[PDB]
Design an enzyme around this catalytic site. Structure first.
Site, PDB file in Angstrom:
ATOM      1  N   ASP A 289      21.534  62.972  -7.516  1.00  8.06           N
ATOM      2  CA  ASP A 289      20.429  62.894  -8.452  1.00  8.06           C
ATOM      3  C   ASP A 289      21.038  62.715  -9.820  1.00  8.06           C
ATOM      4  O   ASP A 289      22.288  62.655  -9.978  1.00  8.06           O
ATOM      5  CB  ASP A 289      19.493  64.075  -8.286  1.00  8.06           C
ATOM      6  N   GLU A 495       8.415  67.259 -12.455  1.00 11.82           N
ATOM      7  CA  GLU A 495       9.579  68.106 -12.467  1.00 11.82           C
ATOM      8  C   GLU A 495       9.261  69.466 -13.166  1.00 11.82           C
ATOM      9  O   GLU A 495       8.204  70.055 -12.901  1.00 11.82           O
ATOM     10  CB  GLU A 495      10.765  67.333 -13.079  1.00 11.82           C
TER      11      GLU A 495
HETATM   12  O1  BGC Z   1      14.773  58.726 -12.102  1.00 11.23           O
HETATM   13  C1  BGC Z   1      15.916  59.043 -11.384  1.00 11.23           C
HETATM   14  C2  BGC Z   1      15.776  60.453 -10.774  1.00 11.23           C
HETATM   15  O2  BGC Z   1      15.519  61.428 -11.801  1.00 11.23           O
HETATM   16  C3  BGC Z   1      15.591  62.736 -11.295  1.00 11.23           C
HETATM   17  O3  BGC Z   1      15.226  63.574 -12.344  1.00 11.23           O
HETATM   18  C4  BGC Z   1      14.608  62.958 -10.093  1.00 11.23           C
HETATM   19  O4  BGC Z   1      14.841  64.291  -9.520  1.00 11.23           O
HETATM   20  C5  BGC Z   1      14.716  61.905  -8.969  1.00 11.23           C
HETATM   21  O5  BGC Z   1      13.611  62.053  -7.999  1.00 11.23           O
HETATM   22  C6  BGC Z   1      14.698  60.498  -9.638  1.00 11.23           C
HETATM   23  O6  BGC Z   1      14.957  59.544  -8.655  1.00 11.23           O
END
Ligand code: BGC
Ligand code: NAG
Ligand code: NAG
Ligand code: NAG
Length: 606
Positions: A289, A495
């Protein structure tokens, strides 16, 4: 196989494994570590991409060439980066990734599908497959070859800010919706070996099962936190859908920020190498990630040398840096040069990256297809989103008493009707997070049909539609309305910003419902990413619909309100009585839901 300057990896007729081996045996350390590096478009330039032999780019949320950019503007940007990559010594094409998680959702004018929780409410895996298919086409419209989806988290506590990205608290439903995968990628052939990567060709995209593993099991739903559960429960709840993904050829897997019993997933060799690779036989690539390796430590980023060692020894193949590539590459090169990370680990990571790139046809079609640009926001895809939105809706009440006439379906012809609420004419709120920005946004952020617009498109020409965002009780009582449609709910989030311990909708929400329903019979449409405290809204309302985050096609809502189709959705999650009960899931011992998983009232089409 023929001319004097023949290079086997460049021969499209050769088997993928032979091409992989041929190319790997020619690469320097620098070329190898470059493949393992994914960078943000924001830090990319032609020299950076060439000089560091970069393997991959992405757009994070909101990382776009400009606001309002056309499909062709996206293609031109992606081809610009590809041209630089193809001009290296070996001409290895880059793969470009993005979060196309409910359509190609960073892009202006893209069809926005309902978020995953609503799709879980459909119990319709084939609909989800068709959404994958349409989303592949809209991604490829923009020149992008790789989608960071599906999120197959099993959200076990709705306090989590990503619960809407989980199809259900029930792993069996999440398992069923892994049909997104062959929609995005194409169906795998008859003979297919589970765990091998697959993409059909240039009209499909590489997928990504995320975030491995137990992202939806965290304590009190705290995002990126610790998931405390024995191995048996990890394997029984959080793991199953990963095996369905292996069976369907998912090309990549992204690792979770979360921990399992105190061990950071991004440092977990036993699960990433021991289980995913060695036991599930996953042969595609494992990606981190975003600054996921950084977050191994506390504070994040306080020992990047350790982050690189731990993550790459754990088995991760490609690192979503996404900014400090020079430091990542330097540190990893140091560790290899010092024998701290063996060449066998490098060669494995690069074998997997190249395997996905050759399998999906990227060496044959490195550039965008301009005839695909017109796929973006195509009406046929909007029709599909509209069907999905309508199927996702869960009718929770349709009459205050058992002897009341049922309010829904509502008649299209009436002298005067009221549309009200903060969510009745707000496209951004009805799409929620991961729409244009990561956190989402308010107002008319893209092309779509709000609830108010859909009402006006639906009703008889003689019906007068009045909008008032937050009318008082007197306005409603005095207005001569036949009925009202009132829409309220959560604001967009994702998030940690979405983590919420109280799950009470913002005011004015309830107060508007009360004022409206007090004066005229009312259907309340609740827009949310998850169950929220709902008894007070239920008590005021004649009918109430859980519409989740239905996306760009508001007419899905009115399709069911006015009886063009009957309500069929069923709760994909438990609806709690109080947040003090949480976590509380079907099958638990003290199960005392307001509405059980699987609940949903029905109507018949008019
Ligand atoms: O955007 C890129 C990534 O950002 C991260 O903060 C998220 O947890 C992922 O689900 C996402 O793919
Ligand atoms: C969980 O969050 C708590 C509260 O902020 C924090 O102190 C702790 O470090 C987090 N744990 C993990 C594993 O992320
Ligand atoms: C509930 O939680 C969020 C923060 O997570 C906060 O913004 C909101 O004001 C809170 N609501 C109540 C009723 O405290
Ligand atoms: C709709 O149709 C069915 C069966 O065809 C009928 O039995 C049912 O009660 C009807 N439902 C409503 C809500 O009228």
């Amino acid at each position: 196989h023929h001319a004097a300057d023949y290079v086997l990896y460049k021969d499209a007729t050769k088997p993928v494994e032979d091409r992989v081996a041929d190319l790997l045996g020619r690469m320097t350390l620098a070329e190898k570590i470059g493949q393992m590096t994914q960078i943000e478009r924001l830090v990319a330039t032609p020299d950076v991409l060439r000089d560091n032999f970069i393997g991959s780019l992405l757009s994070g949320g909101g990382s776009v060439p400009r606001k309002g950019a056309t499909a062709k503007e996206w293609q031109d940007m992606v081809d610009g980066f590809q041209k630089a990559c193809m001009s290296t010594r070996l001409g290895i094409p880059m793969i470009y990734g993005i979060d196309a998680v409910h359509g190609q959702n960073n892009v202006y004018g893209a069809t926005i599908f309902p978020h995953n929780v609503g799709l879980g409410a459909t119990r319709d895996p084939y609909l989800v497959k068709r959404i994958g298919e349409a989303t592949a086409l809209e991604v490829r419209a923009t020149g992008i070859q790789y989608a960071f989806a599906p999120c197959i988290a099993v959200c076990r506590d709705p306090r989590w800010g990503r619960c809407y990205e989980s199809y259900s608290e029930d792993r069996r439903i999440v398992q069923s919706m892994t049909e997104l995968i062959p929609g995005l990628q194409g169906d795998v052939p008859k003979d297919f070996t589970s765990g091998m990567p697959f993409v059909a060709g240039k009209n499909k995209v590489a997928a990504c099962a995320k975030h491995f593993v137990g992202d939806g099991g965290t304590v009190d739903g705290i995002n990126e936190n610790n998931t405390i559960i024995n191995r048996e429960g990890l394997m029984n709840i959080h793991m199953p859908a990963y095996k369905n993904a292996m069976d369907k050829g998912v090309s990549t897997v992204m690792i979770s920020y979360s921990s399992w019993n105190g061990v950071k997933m991004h440092a977990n060799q036993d699960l990433v190498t021991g289980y995913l690779k060695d036991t599930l036989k996953f042969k595609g690539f494992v990606i981190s990630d975003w600054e996921g390796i950084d977050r191994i430590t506390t504070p994040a980023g306080s020992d990047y040398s350790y982050s690189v060692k731990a993550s790459i020894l754990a088995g991760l193949d490609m690192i979503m840096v996404p900014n400090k590539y020079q430091q990542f590459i330097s540190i990893l090169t140091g560790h290899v040069n010092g024998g701290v990370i063996p060449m066998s680990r490098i060669d494995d990571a690069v074998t997997r990256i190249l395997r996905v790139k050759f399998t999906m046809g990227l060496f044959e079609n490195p550039y965008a297809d301009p005839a695909m640009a017109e796929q973006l926001g195509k009406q046929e895809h909007r029709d599909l989103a509209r069907e999905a939105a309508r199927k996702s809706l869960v009718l929770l009440k349709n009459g205050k008493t058992s002897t009341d006439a049922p309010l829904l379906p509502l008649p299209k012809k009436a002298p005067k009707i009221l549309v009200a609420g903060s969510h009745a004419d707000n496209l951004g709120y009805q799409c929620g997070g991961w729409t244009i920005e990561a956190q989402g946004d308010t107002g008319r952020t893209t092309v779509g049909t709000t609830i108010l617009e859909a009402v006006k498109a639906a009703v008889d020409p003689s019906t007068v539609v009045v909008f008032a965002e937050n009318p008082d009780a007197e306005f409603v009582k005095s207005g001569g309305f036949s009925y009202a449609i009132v829409a309220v709910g959560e604001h967009p989030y994702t998030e940690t910003k979405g983590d919420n311990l109280n799950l009470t909708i913002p005011e004015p929400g309830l107060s508007t419902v009360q004022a409206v329903c007090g004066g005229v019979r009312c259907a309340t449409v609740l827009i949310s990413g998850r169950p929220v405290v709902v008894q007070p809204l239920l008590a005021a309302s004649d009918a109430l619909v859980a519409a989740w985050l239905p996306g760009s096609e508001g007419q899905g809502v009115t399709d069911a309100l006015f009886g063009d189709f009957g309500f069929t959705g069923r709760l994909p999650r438990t609806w709690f009585k109080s947040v003090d009960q949480l976590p509380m899931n079907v099958g638990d011992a003290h199960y005392d839901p307001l509405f059980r998983l699987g609940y949903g009232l029905t109507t018949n089409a008019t």
